[PDB]
Amino acid sequence: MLRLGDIAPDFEQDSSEGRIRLHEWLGDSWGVLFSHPADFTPVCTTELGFTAKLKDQFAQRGVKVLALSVDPVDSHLKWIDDINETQDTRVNFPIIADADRKVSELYDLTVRSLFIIDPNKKVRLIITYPASTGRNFNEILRVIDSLQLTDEHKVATPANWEDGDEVVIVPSLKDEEEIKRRFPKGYRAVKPYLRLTPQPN
Amino acid sequence: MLRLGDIAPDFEQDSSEGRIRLHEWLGDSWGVLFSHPADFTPVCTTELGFTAKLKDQFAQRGVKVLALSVDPVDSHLKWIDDINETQDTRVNFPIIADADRKVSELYDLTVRSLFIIDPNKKVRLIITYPASTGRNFNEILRVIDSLQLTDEHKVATPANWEDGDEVVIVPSLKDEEEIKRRFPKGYRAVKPYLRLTPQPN
Ligand SMILES: [Cl-]
Ligand SMILES: [Cl-]
């Protein structure tokens, strides 16, 4: 029902780091909300492990990270021992306890979803993966870079774009003077609808 | 409404390679159905370009690839010139023309969706990306490898798993004799719920 461009619903809820008021807690930065169906599940253990190891990577992009599970806070803190010990890491982000299902109803939640939330609290990507298959975390960082650049500049990122790669002038932008103004590096109209420009940063 | 574990609805429809009866056309292999909102759009041009370049990669995994757009077949064939010329590639897969919206209603279709379909015609992953952001195609191949392995073996793939990496005994499998039987390479119970085993292939 929740979809891309909708506002990520606010909530107040207990976490392994205390009460989180989502919109306040995010403030200015981008957000990632990772859902886990249960505590003490194996793929999720490796996922959180890896999310902890990429803390520098998210902070450097001004991204704040939450995890969400129905199990209570005291359970999350036992699991954080498991994750720390087995994944050789330190969990350094909040795990929400949704023991009343307050957040789970709002985000329309065997599959596990991930929501990327922008500074205006808009949902910018929903990724749902089945229990069988852990996530690739390079892909969420890449997607965040693309999202940040395309909010600041009138570009889209092509297939197999990585931060720094050549981009595409967004098709809606047709005014020649505004293009000249926004892209001093210029562009190659390899087709009239395919205007390739250096990443303008 | 369409979801993971549902059957990918069958359809007969015109394509740049002729009439496609999806279930027949897939037959035994895995499927990827890539949706594009329109022909002659820039990100999609790079996406199809790249899908064409990975034909060896999909075939080697016994995966068949379709693209879907509302524009008519004669339009797809003009666009295939554009894609061939600008992407330095040869489009070698069918692009469905959905000029009656027959397929678009069935798959519940600015965002563009991708459906991974197994040999039993079940939907195994839905990925929806916004217009701003081209896909990473390493990630769809990785996901396919994980899906194929977890259908054949009672394992899940951990975070940042690549074909060959160590996996996890699926949590539902508890019978010790059946574990011994299925995993002669053995496993490390680093926790009772986190049983790491070599990729059994
Ligand atoms: Cl690249
Ligand atoms: Cl790996």
TrEMBL record, chains A, B:
Keyword set includes Acetylation: no
Pfam families, per database record: 1-cysPrx_C, AhpC-TSA
One BP annotation, GO: cell redox homeostasis
List of catalytic residues: 44
InterPro entries: AhpC/TSA, Peroxiredoxin_AhpC-typ, Peroxiredoxin_C, PRX_1cys, Thioredoxin-like_sf, Thioredoxin_domain
Keyword Oxidoreductase listed: yes
CDD domains named in the record: PRX_1cys
Gene3D superfamilies recorded: Antioxidant, Horf6, Chain A, domain2 (3.30.1020.10), Glutaredoxin (3.40.30.10)
GO cellular component, one term: cytosol
Domain Thioredoxin: 2-149
GO MF: peroxiredoxin activity
Signal sequence annotation: none
Swiss-Prot/TrEMBL keywords: Antioxidant, Oxidoreductase, Peroxidase, Redox-active center
Domain of life: Bacteria
PANTHER family for this protein: MCG48959-RELATED (PTHR43503), PEROXIREDOXIN-6 (PTHR43503:SF4)
Family named by the database record: Belongs to the peroxiredoxin family. AhpC/Prx1 subfamily. Belongs to the peroxiredoxin family. Prx6 subfamily.
NCBIfam families, sorted: PRK13189.1
Name of the molecule in the record: Putative thiol-specific antioxidant protein
Organism for this UniProt entry: Pseudomonas aeruginosa (strain UCBPP-PA14)
Phylogenetic classification of the source organism: Bacteria, Pseudomonadati, Pseudomonadota, Gammaproteobacteria, Pseudomonadales
